[PDB]
Nucleic acid binder design. Structure first.
Ligand SMILES: [Mg+2]
Ligand SMILES: [Mg+2]
Ligand SMILES: [Mg+2]
Ligand SMILES: [Mg+2]
Ligand SMILES: [Mg+2]
Ligand SMILES: [Mg+2]
Ligand SMILES: [Mg+2]
Ligand SMILES: [Mg+2]
Ligand SMILES: [Mg+2]
Ligand SMILES: [Mg+2]
Ligand SMILES: [Mg+2]
Ligand SMILES: [Mg+2]
Ligand SMILES: [Mg+2]
Ligand SMILES: [Mg+2]
Ligand SMILES: [Mg+2]
Ligand SMILES: [Mg+2]
Ligand SMILES: [Mg+2]
Ligand SMILES: [Mg+2]
Ligand SMILES: [Mg+2]
Ligand SMILES: [Mg+2]
Ligand SMILES: [Mg+2]
Ligand SMILES: [Mg+2]
Ligand SMILES: [Mg+2]
Ligand SMILES: [Mg+2]
Ligand SMILES: [Mg+2]
Lengths: 78, 103, 50, 99, 227, 77
RNA sequence: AUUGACGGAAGGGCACCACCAGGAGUGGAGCCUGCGGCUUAAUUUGACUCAACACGGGAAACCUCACCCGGCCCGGACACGGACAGGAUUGACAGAUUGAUAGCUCUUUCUCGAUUCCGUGGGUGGUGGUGCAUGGCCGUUCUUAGUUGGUGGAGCGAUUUGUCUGGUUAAUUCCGAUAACGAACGAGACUCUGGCAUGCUAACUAGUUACGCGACCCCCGAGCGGUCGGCGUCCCCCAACUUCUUAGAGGGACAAGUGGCGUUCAGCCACCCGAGAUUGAGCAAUAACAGGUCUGUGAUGCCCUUAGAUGUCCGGGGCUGCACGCGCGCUACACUGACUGGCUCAGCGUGUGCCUACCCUACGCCGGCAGGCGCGGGUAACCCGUUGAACCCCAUUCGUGAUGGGGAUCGGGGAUUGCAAUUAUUCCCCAUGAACGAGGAAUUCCCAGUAAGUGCGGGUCAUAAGCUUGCGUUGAUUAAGUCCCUGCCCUUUGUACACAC
């Protein structure tokens, strides 16, 4: 199916909004960060959340995605 | 001095492994040659019954099962020292069986 | 009175809960009816893992 | 029912000595496990306790093909006057507490 | 010694002993708030720990009833005399115990009380005792001579998966009445609490909990302290 | 403040036995036996102040469980 | 006017309990087994489309047993009254009698010693009735995606928005549009299991590798030669180690990386690296159904019966009866085979029992076989056991013939279990040798270690599997789609329906 559910997406979004300064586009370092900063009860949910976090950080670079509010708004002086 | 063998049996892995850890740590603190935990093959006892009390339905079955885990510890020490290695807060679902080099 | 031999068969064995002679489970030394087993399984220690 | 007086005296003596009486619902067991030395059938234990329960001298419980009987405070006085016991002898359960 | 038995038969026999002892105590100490039994093996004695709400009636009159229970347990299960001691202990919180609450609802129904006020009272007590959710289902001949089932829910109640084995405790009981038998199902969802006896330790497996970031005042110009 | 709440006490239990029970941990200051009004026995509660907040903090983990007079007693702050 | 249900309405979606492409079939034959009918003393009975019919764990010789024939027993508490140590009343050897060595009944008299007997009330027991009085459990709708509050918007409400045009997904799974926003149950997550680790923790109840001893083979004189499930290094070094085995902790996979499509969104397709890019199950919502079970229960209401008993025990019979009609299956119709011999490989898992009698078996000796007699191991990673399984593989015979295919039916004999084998329990040997030449109309189940072939354990079990439940072994054809058929779900639409035409 490969369709991530609401728990994965909502958790990923809150993780990004609170810890944007510590996530790159690297699934393994993201996985380690999300296992340090969150309390995820399993390892499959940890991996799915880190995967969606990686996929979203690969979209933050190409414009503000609808749903995430971060400090990146300030640097848009234009 | 004998070849004392402690056999620990349980239905859950957590308490069994923690009792094994306590015994090994207590025995290592008092300088014993401890041949550590040997793990025998877990026995799975399986009973498959019909779900229904009557004899009507879609013929579905119920698969109950119970695992039994077994651990061994080999000490080479006098009896009175193993009498204080053991007797330290054995968990409920664990059962020990000392064999003092003879039946 | 109780003259007939009852050393084997369904007559010899009965459930240890209800004394019913049908559906008896003798495996591992239970001697329990299938329904009584299905009721007391969790108390005995038979979890339903799969 | 009809049982020898020795059997009834033995059953009552054991019941008053402990204060409890356990039996198995099996009318064909030839000897009761606790009274085997006096050779009483299980049926006599079951029916003597039935005759005691209907008069209100024992409380009865039943679980998993086994009867349990406790000796009430009327049964104590009854069996004390029946067995001709001096009123100092006490059942094991009642009044044998320990500080 | 002469008695030796395979580990399979031994574990099944131990489970059967615990099941029969629990059934006997459930029938015997029903109106005393009996919740559970725990058999603890010690080198000198065998301790049967009875969990009850009203442990003073379990103890009896100056210890009489606990002595009678000890005597029947010894005489039925064939323990050596003096090797089995029965202790009673009070359950910590009564609201988070489905067996105690099912028995409470049972005895409230045995006395003359209406089924709806009794279920609402039990449900309100369970919810006020810290439960995340509760469900009480009473089925039987409630209104007339055509049976129906009335359920009363308040709060969260999970049903499926593995968490329903440690976050939910259920209890089924019967109530013999003049016109029939009533069935009482009570199930309570315990609250999460780390390092506590109120409920489970491990959280629900789909409850991510992000730790709040510390306030991070940023630096302006590099500085270093030579301590 | 040396607060000890003994629970699950027996009817036989009086001030003296609680005294002799907590005496191997030291000296006492104030026993409080929650007796029944107009009826001479306990209601299942005892409030103990041990004149020092440290040895009571040792005895809470000591006299826990213990099965006194066929009643397992739960002690708490 | 609203909510449900229905329409021999109109649009979308989904499913090998639906189809398409196919595989194996079933339906045809013989037999095993369940149901109906018929017969009978009785042939106990529940259930009838899926959701009845190898189902009641239901493979019934006795028991089970509920049915039929016949005969004992009270295991009729307790209360009241009567009779009673001048005996209330229990047992009983002999003859008859009986199926009986039931003192059941009769003659005969002994014995027992307040426990009983007899009337009235009241118990108790019941695989008796009612599952359309019920509890629990189970099945089904439906394992499909469905269900419901809080606040806010819309109305006198009932109701309704959320819960949606569309895209996507296994999924009311998400993304988007947007009077909704934020949530809950179900789905997912979760638990068990399968696949990976020469990394960690360890092991004479698992082994490997070295070393030593021994047997055998070549050889010229041969060898850091080859074979060894032969022995030993467990007397503590006089060897180390964990690859294989076991099982703990962690790690590991996330559509993560690269292209392409897509509203550059959720996602989909392909590929690299990888053990693995969809392992298989368990659990499983709100509402229901006069679904099944009173024959699982010391779960249970009411009714029936209760001593010439529908309690209970014993003896015998029956469930199995046989012109016939169905359902689940097993064996086959042969040469891609049968027969004879030879050679080589498994994985689950069980094993001496409270009452309870009944375990798995190595090795030796008799017998042609089933079997018998000795003797030892095992309460089990210790013994059976390196579980020498079958199909398969290698050679021989046969030769397209109802044949050396098939093994029904039937005759004779020998053993085992049991207290008892006839209406054949099961097993073995010789003999007989039927239909059946690939099965009409219809119809089932299924997509990867899957179908199918092939054996082995468990349950039942004193005796026993053509059943079921698991396990490995050899191992594919076809497909990566659709709404045509059969059903479900949603939306619009009509209603004189709300116990749903
Ligand atoms: Mg959920
Ligand atoms: Mg799930
Ligand atoms: Mg087709
Ligand atoms: Mg076939
Ligand atoms: Mg056929
Ligand atoms: Mg269906
Ligand atoms: Mg048979
Ligand atoms: Mg016969
Ligand atoms: Mg019969
Ligand atoms: Mg007679
Ligand atoms: Mg005679
Ligand atoms: Mg009954
Ligand atoms: Mg029904
Ligand atoms: Mg029902
Ligand atoms: Mg509103
Ligand atoms: Mg019906
Ligand atoms: Mg029932
Ligand atoms: Mg009979
Ligand atoms: Mg039949
Ligand atoms: Mg069928
Ligand atoms: Mg042939
Ligand atoms: Mg022929
Ligand atoms: Mg078998
Ligand atoms: Mg069968
Ligand atoms: Mg079809």
């Amino acid at each position: 199916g490969r369709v991530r559910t609401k728990t994965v997406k909502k958790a990923a979004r809150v993780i990004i909004e609170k810890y944007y300064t510590r996530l790159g586009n690297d699934f393994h370092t993201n996985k380690r960060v999300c296992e340090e900063i969150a309390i995820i009860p399993s390892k499959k949910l940890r991996n799915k959340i880190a995967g969606y976090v990686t996929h979203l950080m690969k979209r933050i670079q190409r414009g503000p995605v609808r749903g995430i509010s971060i400090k990146l708004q300030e640097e848009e002086r234009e | 001095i004998h070849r004392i063998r402690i056999t620990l049996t349980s239905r859950n892995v957590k308490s069994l492994e923690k009792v094994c850890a306590d015994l090994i740590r207590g025995a290592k603190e008092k300088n014993l040659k401890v041949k550590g935990p040997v793990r025998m093959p877990t026995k799975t006892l399986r009973i498959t019954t019909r779900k229904t009390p009557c004899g009507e339905g879609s013929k579905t079955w119920d698969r109950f099962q119970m695992r039994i885990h077994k651990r061994l510890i080999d000490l080479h020490s006098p009896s009175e020292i193993v009498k204080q290695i053991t007797s330290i807060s054995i968990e409920p679902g664990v059962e020990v069986e000392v064999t003092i080099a003879d039946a | 009175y109780w003259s007939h031999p009852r050393k084997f068969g369904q007559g010899s064995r009965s459930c240890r809960v209800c004394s019913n002679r049908h559906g008896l489970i003798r495996k591992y030394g239970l001697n329990m009816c299938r329904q009584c087993f299905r009721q007391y399984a969790k108390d005995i220690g038979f979890i339903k893992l799969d | 029912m009809l049982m020898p007086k020795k059997n009834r005296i033995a059953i009552y003596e054991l019941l008053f000595k402990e204060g409890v009486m356990v039996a198995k619902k099996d009318v064909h067991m030839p000897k009761h496990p606790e009274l085997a030395d006096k050779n009483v059938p299980n049926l006599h234990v079951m029916k003597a306790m039935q005759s005691l329960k209907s008069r209100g001298y024992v409380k009865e419980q039943f679980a998993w093909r086994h009867f349990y009987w406790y000796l009430t405070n009327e049964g104590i006085q009854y069996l004390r006057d029946y067995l001709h016991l001096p009123p100092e002898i006490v059942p094991a359960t009642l009044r044998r507490s320990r500080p | 010694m002469a008695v030796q038995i395979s580990k399979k038969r031994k574990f099944v026999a131990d489970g059967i002993f615990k099941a029969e002892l629990n059934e006997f105590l459930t029938r015997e100490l029903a109106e005393d708030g009996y919740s559970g039994v725990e058999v603890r093996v010690t080198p000198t004695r065998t301790e049967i720990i009875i969990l009850a709400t009203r442990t003073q009636n379990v103890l009896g009159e100056k210890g009489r009833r606990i002595r009678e229970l000890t005597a029947v347990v010894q005489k039925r299960f064939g323990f050596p005399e003096g090797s089995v001691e029965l202790y009673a202990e009070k359950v910590a919180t009564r609201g988070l115990c489905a067996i105690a609450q099912a028995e409470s609802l049972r005895y409230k129904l045995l006395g003359g009380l209406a089924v709806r006020r009794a279920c609402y009272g039990v449900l309100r007590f369970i919810m006020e005792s810290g439960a995340k959710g509760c469900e009480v289902v009473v089925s039987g001949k409630l209104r007339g001579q055509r049976a129906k089932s009335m359920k009363f829910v308040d709060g969260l109640m999970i049903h499926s998966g593995d968490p329903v084995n440690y976050y939910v405790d259920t209890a089924v009981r019967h109530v013999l009445l003049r016109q029939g038998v009533l069935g009482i199902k009570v199930k309570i969802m315990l609250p999460w609490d780390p390092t506590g006896k109120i409920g489970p330790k491990k959280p629900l497996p789909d409850h991510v909990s992000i730790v709040e970031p510390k306030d991070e005042i940023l630096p302006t110009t590099p500085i270093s302290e030579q301590k | 403040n040396a607060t000890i709440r003994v629970t699950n006490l027996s009817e036989d239990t009086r001030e003296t036995d609680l005294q002799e029970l907590f005496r191997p941990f030291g000296s006492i200051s104030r026993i409080y036996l929650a007796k029944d009004k107009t009826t001479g026995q306990s209601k299942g509660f005892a409030f103990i102040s041990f004149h020092r907040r440290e040895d009571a903090a040792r005895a809470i983990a000591g006299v826990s469980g213990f099965g006194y007079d066929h009643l397992i007693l739960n002690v708490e702050w």
